Amino acid sequence: ERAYNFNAGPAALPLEVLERAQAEFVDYQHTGMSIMEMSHRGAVYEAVHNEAQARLLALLGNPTGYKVLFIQGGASTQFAMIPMNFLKEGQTANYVMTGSWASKALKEAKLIGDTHVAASSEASNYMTLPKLQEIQLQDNAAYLHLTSNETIEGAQFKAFPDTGSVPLIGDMSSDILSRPFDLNQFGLVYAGAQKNLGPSGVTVVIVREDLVAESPKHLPTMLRYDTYVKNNSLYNTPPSFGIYMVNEVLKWIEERGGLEGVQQANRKKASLIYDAIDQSGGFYRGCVDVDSRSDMNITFRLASEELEKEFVKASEQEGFVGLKGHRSVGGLRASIYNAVPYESCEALVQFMEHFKRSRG
Amino acid sequence: ERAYNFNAGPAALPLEVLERAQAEFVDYQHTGMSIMEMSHRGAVYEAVHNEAQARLLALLGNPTGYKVLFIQGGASTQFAMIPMNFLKEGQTANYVMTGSWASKALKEAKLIGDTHVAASSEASNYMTLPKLQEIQLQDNAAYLHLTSNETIEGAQFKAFPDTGSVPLIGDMSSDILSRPFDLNQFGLVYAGAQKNLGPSGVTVVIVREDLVAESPKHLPTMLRYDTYVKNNSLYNTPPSFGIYMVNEVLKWIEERGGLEGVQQANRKKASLIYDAIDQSGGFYRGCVDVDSRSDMNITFRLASEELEKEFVKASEQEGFVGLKGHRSVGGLRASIYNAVPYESCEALVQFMEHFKRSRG
Ligand SMILES: *Cc1c(COP(=O)(O)O)cnc(C)c1O
Ligand SMILES: *Cc1c(COP(=O)(O)O)cnc(C)c1O
């Protein structure tokens, strides 16, 4: 009575989180109010709001000098808000182009100012992530933006470059808090919460405070990072139920053993599915190079569009949700974020085997 | 075991809505998923998403030519997005200045282009709403913006001007769907949902489609109205649980007899409290003129700051939440949105009487 949910965004939440939030949904901690009916400047909501920030940092080793912001508008709004805040006249926003979400991010930056493609995997049809360990950039680079996990193509960086005084910025929408990383490599990371952290309606932005101490004063108040830093994301009404749900997911992540624990669990999930593809005698084919494989979104094809359509419908009828890939990629996508249980992955590879043999 | 919740934003939800959403929070309609774990491009979420729009229009008499959008960022983001979309070079954004939220809206518009104060109640310290039936505006007016209910001052317009070819725009954050109005008077109305429609994290924007058929192409994609119109608010991931909760509130509003029913109920609630103030032999004093009184946010003072502090603490100890007014106004504010039951209002006037006599 739980669907095999492979949705890519919004996506699975841990059942335990759903049950906890359900239980106190009408009356939170005997206050006689739902968390949804409380003031965002009240102590009860504020405890949740602040706890979420601290837990998030703690999962990342609690490096100093970083502020966790909760901003509305999704990752797509960050695509504009980042160059609005950081792309000064005369500077160039540099992008690493690894597929669909990098392309969206670049497009927005061009509306705001000068851009440059600093690296690209388009020549491999996004199968081969670019090597970034070098990359050359200019002095007048405003930042280097990359996408840590290309949710649609199924490619994912294992590591990130040292960019010196050029701030590194990462769209980590589809893999944030799936794996340890060194936040100090980045000036800003961001993620719509709805892939690996909870509900839609909240974007987590973690920013180096020295980079946003004085935001451009010509910008709309709600599009300045300092509005959020200096007002603790409460300048206006925050997405308070969404942040409450992020806090509950963060508690769950710690229960699962933190980022190192979920990474191990996710590697196991992913390894099962990649093995099912790799041992399929070519019946299933991974979309990206082995060394670029994502552990969050596993993309693969069959020998024909007809077979892929059959896979999608038959999977849907056996209770799998969300496996059809994006049209630009075609084929299938198994999204296997933290909360997607190993059991769903087992069911999926069992199904993959049954399908293959039922076609054999 | 329900608090007497007079919070001003986020605020009370109907208990019935909380109970319905609690009941299907883990498993929505036997899908084996929460509504929160579903794809926003799936049929199940889409039914909710589209239903909410239709129900909203239906509550307003279903006038043609209007699109209901769900936008993130709160009403505060609309303060920028409205002039970004409508304040063309050479045109002037005209504002009606009625207190704190009008002032916030004007401030944002000045970042974007030329503004003008077309009417103001500042000379009455915002006690006396301006008469708008006339108002003079120029040819080069981009729009006339007003605030239908000034949530902090407790003032509210009973009616709106006929502005001809100049679009009328209304911030109805704190009174939307509390009363019938003629949507055809407006080119755009908007409201953060968290005052009278549900959860925080969603802003309802209802726009005349002929006004936004081609939004300014220099704007960030997420700050164009046509992105939302043409993609049915699903260009990116929407605040899907928030929209689900708005849909549930809209069902409740219809159950309560629609806008005409809730208006009557709210008038009764409000009348009880205004009577308690007016019959108090001056112990309680309304902040605004009788003819400008809001039925959503009732503001009042006592003879001294000391008495007001006593009121606030004693009310808090008897289980009233949120009655302390904003500092700029001082005194008290009873926020009595649709979902605040008559019973809370009864408890409040009983308390007001007990307090008064316990000081007498
Ligand atoms: C889903 C996704 C986005 C878009 O997020 P929204 O909240 O829908 O704007 C951006 N980047 C990546 C990597 C994503 O996976
Ligand atoms: C609360 C309120 C706002 C601000 O809404 P946010 O969602 O917090 O940005 C704007 N206008 C009015 C009239 C309000 O009552």
Swiss-Prot record, chains A, B:
<feature type="binding site">
    <location>
        <position position="151"/>
    </location>
    <ligand>
        <name>pyridoxal 5'-phosphate</name>
    </ligand>
</feature>
<dbReference type="InterPro" id="IPR022278">
    <property type="entry name" value="Pser_aminoTfrase"/>
</dbReference>
<keyword id="KW-0028">Amino-acid biosynthesis</keyword>
<dbReference type="InterPro" id="IPR000192">
    <property type="entry name" value="Aminotrans_V_dom"/>
</dbReference>
<dbReference type="GO" id="GO:0030170">
    <property type="term" value="F:pyridoxal phosphate binding"/>
</dbReference>
<comment type="pathway">
    <text>Amino-acid biosynthesis; L-serine biosynthesis; L-serine from 3-phospho-D-glycerate: step 2/3.</text>
</comment>
<comment type="similarity">
    <text>Belongs to the class-V pyridoxal-phosphate-dependent aminotransferase family. SerC subfamily.</text>
</comment>
<dbReference type="InterPro" id="IPR020578">
    <property type="entry name" value="Aminotrans_V_PyrdxlP_BS"/>
</dbReference>
<dbReference type="InterPro" id="IPR015421">
    <property type="entry name" value="PyrdxlP-dep_Trfase_major"/>
</dbReference>
<dbReference type="InterPro" id="IPR015422">
    <property type="entry name" value="PyrdxlP-dep_Trfase_small"/>
</dbReference>
<feature type="binding site">
    <location>
        <position position="41"/>
    </location>
    <ligand>
        <name>L-glutamate</name>
    </ligand>
</feature>
<keyword id="KW-0963">Cytoplasm</keyword>
<feature type="binding site">
    <location>
        <position position="101"/>
    </location>
    <ligand>
        <name>pyridoxal 5'-phosphate</name>
    </ligand>
</feature>
<feature type="binding site">
    <location>
        <begin position="236"/>
        <end position="237"/>
    </location>
    <ligand>
        <name>pyridoxal 5'-phosphate</name>
    </ligand>
</feature>
<dbReference type="InterPro" id="IPR015424">
    <property type="entry name" value="PyrdxlP-dep_Trfase"/>
</dbReference>
<keyword id="KW-0032">Aminotransferase</keyword>
<feature type="binding site">
    <location>
        <position position="171"/>
    </location>
    <ligand>
        <name>pyridoxal 5'-phosphate</name>
    </ligand>
</feature>
<dbReference type="GO" id="GO:0004648">
    <property type="term" value="F:O-phospho-L-serine:2-oxoglutarate aminotransferase activity"/>
</dbReference>
<dbReference type="Pfam" id="PF00266">
    <property type="entry name" value="Aminotran_5"/>
</dbReference>
<comment type="subunit">
    <text>Homodimer.</text>
</comment>
<feature type="modified residue" description="N6-(pyridoxal phosphate)lysine">
    <location>
        <position position="195"/>
    </location>
</feature>
<dbReference type="GO" id="GO:0006564">
    <property type="term" value="P:L-serine biosynthetic process"/>
</dbReference>
<comment type="pathway">
    <text>Cofactor biosynthesis; pyridoxine 5'-phosphate biosynthesis; pyridoxine 5'-phosphate from D-erythrose 4-phosphate: step 3/5.</text>
</comment>
<keyword id="KW-0808">Transferase</keyword>
<keyword id="KW-0663">Pyridoxal phosphate</keyword>
<dbReference type="GO" id="GO:0005737">
    <property type="term" value="C:cytoplasm"/>
</dbReference>
<keyword id="KW-0718">Serine biosynthesis</keyword>
<feature type="binding site">
    <location>
        <begin position="75"/>
        <end position="76"/>
    </location>
    <ligand>
        <name>pyridoxal 5'-phosphate</name>
    </ligand>
</feature>
<protein>
    <recommendedName>
        <fullName>Phosphoserine aminotransferase</fullName>
        <ecNumber>2.6.1.52</ecNumber>
    </recommendedName>
</protein>
<comment type="function">
    <text>Catalyzes the reversible conversion of 3-phosphohydroxypyruvate to phosphoserine and of 3-hydroxy-2-oxo-4-phosphonooxybutanoate to phosphohydroxythreonine.</text>
</comment>
<feature type="binding site">
    <location>
        <position position="194"/>
    </location>
    <ligand>
        <name>pyridoxal 5'-phosphate</name>
    </ligand>
</feature>
